[PDB]
Amino acid sequence: DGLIRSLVDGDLEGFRQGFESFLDQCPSFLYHVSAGRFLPVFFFSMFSTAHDANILNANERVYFRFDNHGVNPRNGENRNTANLKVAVYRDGQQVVRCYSISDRPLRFSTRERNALVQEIRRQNPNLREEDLNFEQYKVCMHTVFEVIREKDRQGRDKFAKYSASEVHFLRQLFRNHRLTIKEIEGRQLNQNQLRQLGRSVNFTRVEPGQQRIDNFMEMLASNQRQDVRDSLRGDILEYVTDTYNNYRAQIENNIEGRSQKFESHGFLLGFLANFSHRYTIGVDLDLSPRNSHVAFLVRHQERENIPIVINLATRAPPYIALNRARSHAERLHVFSFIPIHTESRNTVCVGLNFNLNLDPFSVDTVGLQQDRFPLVQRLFECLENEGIRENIRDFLLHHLPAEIPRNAENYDRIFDCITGFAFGNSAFDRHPLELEEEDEAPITKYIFRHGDEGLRCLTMVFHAEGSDIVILHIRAHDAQQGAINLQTLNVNGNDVHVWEVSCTLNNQLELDIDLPNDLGLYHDYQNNNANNFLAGDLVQVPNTENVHNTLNQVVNDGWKNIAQHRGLFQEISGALMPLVDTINVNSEDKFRSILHGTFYASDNPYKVLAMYKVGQTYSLKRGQEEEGERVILTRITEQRLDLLLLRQPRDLDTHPIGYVLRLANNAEEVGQQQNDARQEIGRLKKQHRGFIPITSGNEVVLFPIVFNRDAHEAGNLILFPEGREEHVHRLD
């Protein structure tokens, strides 16, 4: 049964399991349950569309109101949050089931009861007031979500004194936002004020349409892109916009500063959730600032389904929102897990704006773009091209982990990820430079170790043999810093130019790339700056072809061979040991980003993902039933793989490889960190549903990897497990 069906029937275990399955499908749903009225509008959408989906029958009457929180008693500022009050009553019944939904562990007040009885007796005048028995339920979410059936109470104790909106009303009436519940209860109201307080609380009947939406997801789960496009154009999007507009008054009334963004996405999600029990609907939200993206995939149980990328705009015209959907869909291999679950090359893009009466939506088809960005190649051709510099900027920023906040407190984390990823990409790229003049050139790479041990600045030198030289800088905002000495480079040519490309991560945590400056011919650059040379050593990057060869065997035939993995990291250690004091690996973020860029820059594997969420675990807690009271608590803890490697399907086994990383300060702490990582692999072994849609096989490989910052030789830099084999996890 569906979510709303189980909830309306009082099936709390069925609803809990049903809602747990939806949270698997929408792995970021919990991040937004407190953003405005995201959660109340979500459950309202499910209720307001349940009849058209044949979940609820015509004789089941649904009444709802938004119990808006109003003024904050702490500081006097208005809030844009609320509770959702919903009640359901079947015609020939005596039980009225009342549901209070919010993001804090609220009940139906006396006035909400009276208004509800008034509304129910209007629809069925054959009833006496003493015929209606009330069951009260609660759904609250804050890593914990609880479903609750209230006790069987008697008399006036069955309902609360005031709703949230009643408290706001009375605080406005008394011109004092600081009044508590007890202080408000002590003040007297006149007859007019009591009647006003009655009008402020009223329920609206959910009135369904004549259109059935039973088979809407049948059209979105189609393997034909024209079918997905046309169904969205002339059917599905029209229904969603029409249903939202039919309740626009209740959504926009008695609230200021509502998050139209998070309420738009909640309404769309609630529509999709009414189908989550009949289809496998993975949903990827990106509601970070300046981003309003929803991408989802509708599957019956398959790998050839069409991704749908929607951009929900609140004030932008329809064509602008569509372009943002197009732009987001092209880079979907970077931003989303949806390309992992389907082999489709094309996606359907939707720009949507509920606040428009003319062209609220527009649809187009866009092809997925390969995420094979060659950083070193693009660096050489960006010297006089602002467009390529913007591409480079986006390449570094868009590969950051999404769950790392871009605030001032996480500056070092962001700076470690960008420098580590850029280093891993450029130091381990084996390809030569493709020149404009129908030619190629071997590239000798270098990394500079500054004299200042605390200068946040990554400096690298790229020398295309016979062509130009490019110095790359990735500095912090406060990196107050002469010229880089280039005497160690074997340069024999009177036509080599030295270029400098500087990148800065400013206080706003946006990557600003300066205008690339030509510093002159090589010998002129060296003749000058003779007294302007910065203190430090220019270390040459070792040859890395053994890394790519061993990495090719690990991704493919040596998939489950422990020795193949050990040889890979022995080669990585051997390549990094001459550079350990220069690259300065001082955080787990830096170590992860280096390996991320190292795997990305290699032709194998096809995809490498950092901080990939594979799913969640749910720990339940049930209270013993006491006088009809039921309490079910579900605690949720996430499971993320630090690195995930995947092979190109052909045999459709993607050979999934997962690496759990730890950073050790010395050789003594390696044992604790390795044991600590094997415990995290143990918890990862419980996750199964998250591994099925990424591969057609039945097994996944997991390894614990430890970096030792105090190593003196490559044999002790990256530690690999030397008992029973514990790296093959079989799926069911």
């Binding site: 393997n223 002339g234 569509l322 090359r345 939506f361 094979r372 190629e440």
Partner: protein, 406 residues
């Protein structure tokens, strides 16, 4: 800008070179340019993405050449010759010739063009046999990042030109979605095997997973098949085999091929409706071909065997009409003002829409009042290409409905 925007900009720039007295040939050749550059996926855009000035004028000279065109389709044999010359029209060739010789199967030039690249790359490096093998592999791995065609021809152990049997080359070209490779190895097949291999390739690519790069291969193989009746009967045995063939051909503007196939129960009711919407979607994407696209729509609309299909396509049910989008896009095209079309053409487009509307009223007169409202809501709720902003296109439908009721 998006990658699709950059390809469309390059396509429009290259289409400036298409000149011909017949305006239908101009439109057909422009769509061929778009396929060459690429629409949803990069095709030759990767090799020309930075081209400006004389580098663009070089491509303009190749595309203005009548010798490079076979009707509205590109002559791959001629292109391989032009793209491997050192100079055309006094302008040096800006393309990497080894890449072009690989793409266009100029097998006479593949190996010597590769030697020049190999030697210049080797000489930049700071056993002589094993090192040369390493340099060769490094060069092939570097170029192949742009596709498997760029290491298909060079043996990695010896450095010699690879020699393929025609069957092996044909299969590999279909696997690579390598249009020019299919045509080359097809010419080297045994005459006894040609009809069979064409059938194998058509059945292999006609699937729900097909992409736009399958369309040129499907167009080539269909037009070489002598017995199209047996091909359609075999193709009808695969799931969505006939749909995938027709759909990809329609979306790549191979209208002449679809026309011949229609003139010659092979698809379902939904497939018929998707043909109409794909044809009208392409109509708005390529307004210079709206005449040919409309004639293909009216052909699907006038087939006597498809009398049942056309009836159900206008049957309003569950607050929707299967063809509401098709009517909407025909009205958008009728009222397009970004291209030039005489008042006679605009009158012919209005009549087409009026006749189709009269068929919907005649088939379900009790439903025609809702049918009119759904078409109006479609024109008011869905933005489309070629549809002017802030203009109530629903009024254009209401004008048409009033004229029908007189």
């Amino acid at each position: 800008p998006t990658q699709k925007e950059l390809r469309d900009t390059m396509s429009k720039k290259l289409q400036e070179a298409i000149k011909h007295p017949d305006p239908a040939v101009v439109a057909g050749r422009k769509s061929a340019i778009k396929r060459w550059v690429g629409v949803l996926q990069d095709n030759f855009m990767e090799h020309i993405k930075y081209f400006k000035g004389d580098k663009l004028k070089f491509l303009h000279n190749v595309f203005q050449d009548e010798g490079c065109w076979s009707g509205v389709r590109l002559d791959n044999a001629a292109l391989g010759q032009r793209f491997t010359e050192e100079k055309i029209g006094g302008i040096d060739n800006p393309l990497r010739k080894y890449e072009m010789a690989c793409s266009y199967c100029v097998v006479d030039k593949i190996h010597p063009l590769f030697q020049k690249r190999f030697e210049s790359y080797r000489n930049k490096f700071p056993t002589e046999t094993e090192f040369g093998k390493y340099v060769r592999n490094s060069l092939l791995d570097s170029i192949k990042r742009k596709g498997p065609v760029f290491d298909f021809w060079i043996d990695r152990e010896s450095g010699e030109l690879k020699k393929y049997d025609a069957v092996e080359g044909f299969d590999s070209a279909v696997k690579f979605k390598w249009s020019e490779g299919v045509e080359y190895f097809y010419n080297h097949l045994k005459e006894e095997d040609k009809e069979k291999k064409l059938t194998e390739a058509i059945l292999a690519l006609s699937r729900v997973q097909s992409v736009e790069k399958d369309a040129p291969i499907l167009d080539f193989c269909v037009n070489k098949i002598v017995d199209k009746d047996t091909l359609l009967q075999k193709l009808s045995q695969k799931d969505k085999g006939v749909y995938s063939l027709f759909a990809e051909l329609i979306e790549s503007c191979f209208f002449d091929t679809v026309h011949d196939l229609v003139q010659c129960k092979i698809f379902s009711q939904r497939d018929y409706e998707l043909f109409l919407s794909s044809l009208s979607d392409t109509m708005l994407k390529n307004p210079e071909l709206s005449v040919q696209a409309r004639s293909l729509i009216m052909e699907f609309w006038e087939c006597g065997s498809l009398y049942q299909y056309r009836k159900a396509a206008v049957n309003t049910s569950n607050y929707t009409v299967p063809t509401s989008g098709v009517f909407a896009e025909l009205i958008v095209n009728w009222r397009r003002e970004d291209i030039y079309k005489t008042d006679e053409e605009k009158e012919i487009e209005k009549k087409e829409i009026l006749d189709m509307m009269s068929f919907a009223k005649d088939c379900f007169p009790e439903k025609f009042e809702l049918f009119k409202k759904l078409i109006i809501r479609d024109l008011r709720l869905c933005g489309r290409e070629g549809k002017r902003v802030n203009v109530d296109y629903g009024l254009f439908a209401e004008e048409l409905f009033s004229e029908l009721e007189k």
